[PDB]
Amino acid sequence: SMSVKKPKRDDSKDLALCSMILTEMETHEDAWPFLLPVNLKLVPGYKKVIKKPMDFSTIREKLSSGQYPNLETFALDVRLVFDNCETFNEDDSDIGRAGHNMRKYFEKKWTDTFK
Domain boundaries, the chain: 1-115
Resolution, given in Å to one decimal, reads 2.0
Separation between Cα atoms, residue 61 and residue 65, nearest integer Å = 6
- As a CATH number, domain 1-115 is 1.20.920.10
Return all residues near 98 (Cβ < 8 A) that are at least 6 apart: 30, 31, 32, 33, 34, 85
Q: Are 95 and 89 a contacting pair, CB within 8 Å? A: yes
Q: How was this structure determined?
A: X-ray
**Which long-range contacts link 53-62 to residues 24+ away (Cβ below 8 Å)?**
53/84, 54/80, 54/81, 54/84, 55/81, 56/22, 56/25, 56/26, 56/31, 56/81, 59/22, 60/22, 60/26
